[PDB]
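Need C-alpha cells for this chain, all 392 residues.
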Amino acid sequence: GGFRSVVYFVNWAIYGRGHNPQDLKADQFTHILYAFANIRPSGEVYLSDTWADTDKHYPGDKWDEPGNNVYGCIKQMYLLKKNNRNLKTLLSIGGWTYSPNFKTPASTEEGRKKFADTSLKLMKDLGFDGIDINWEYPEDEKQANDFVLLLKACREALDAYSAKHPNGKKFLLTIASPAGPQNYNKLKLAEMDKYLDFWNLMAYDFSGSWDKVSGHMSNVFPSTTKPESTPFSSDKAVKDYIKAGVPANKIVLGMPLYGRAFASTDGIGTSFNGVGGGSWENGVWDYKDMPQQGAQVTELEDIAASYSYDKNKRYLISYDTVKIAGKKAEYITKNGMGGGMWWESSSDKTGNESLVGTVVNGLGGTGKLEQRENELSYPESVYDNLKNGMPS
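Here are the C-alpha cells for all 392 residues:
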C-alpha cells in the first residue's frame, strides 16, 4: 500500500475552536484519531465528553426519533466514513493529561483485560475502525513491560472480534509514540511492534517554555552549526526505531499544525523568558494564524525547520511552512516511512496554504495514500441508528 495521512480530531475542538468533524477535508486523510478517552483504575476505558462525543445533536439529527441512538462527533464521524470509504477512524485513549492513569490497570492482568474489553466494546459500539493508545510515558522497565502486555491484550481483543465476524474487516491498533530518546529508550519497541498496525511518532514539542534557549520544536535534522537550537530531531528517533526493529514503513512522522512561541528573544538558539500569548493557551499558536504581523519567517530547509521572528517584540514562534511541510513529505518518501500524522485538525489553513495539502501532494497526492476500505458494518452496536448504518 502507500502512505498514511493521519490526524487527531480533538473532541474539545467543537467548543471554542468551533471545529466539528463535518469540517474535515476527509478526502485528504486515511485515519482520524478521535482523542481522547479516559481510563478508570479498574482499566475501564470511558468517553471523556459524552455531550461532544455522543449526545450533541447536529443538523441532521432528529431530536425525537425511535431507537437507542448515538449523536455527537461519533455519529458525525461515522457519516464521514460512509462518504469517504478510505477514511478509517480510531478511538484514542490517554494523551498527556490522562496518561497518569495508565500504569495502575496496566500492571494487572485484570486491569489490562478490562482495558482491552472496554476499549473494544466502545470501538464496536461507536463505529470505530480501531483503537490508539497514547501513553506519555511508560516511566520504567515495569511500565515498559506492561505496555507490551496491554497492546498484546488489545490486539488479541480486536482479533477475537474479527474472528467473530469473518465477513468483516480486521481492526487497527496504533500508539502515539515518543520522539525523545529518554522516553523511547525505555520502551520494548520491537516486541510492541509485533502488535501494532503502525506507530505515529510524535515528532513535536522538542522545544517550549521548559527550555532556556529557543529551539526548533519539530525539526527533522540536528543543526551542526547551531546545536543549541535543535535539542531533538525526527531523524534521531526514526533511525533508532529502525535499529530497534520497527519497519520504517510502519512509522508515521508526526507533524504539528501549531507553533510554540518564545518571548524576549534575539532569535532561535538565544534565551527567552516567557512564552507570550497564544491562539487558545499561552506560548502556543494555531498555524492558520501564522504568519503574525510584523515578524519575518526563516526556513532552514537543511534541517527542515522554520519559524517566524518579530525583531521589535523579540518573539519567536517555531512552526512549519509549506516549504518545510514539503521537506518533511520528502523525508517520508525518501525514507520509505509510513506517512504523516498531525496534531491537530483545527489549526491548518486551507487551499494551497494547507500544510496537510502540501504533504499529501508531496507524497504523490491522494492516489499514493494507503488504500484500505473502512468498516461500516457494526453488527454488535448497542445503538440502533449506528447498527443500522445511519439512515434518515
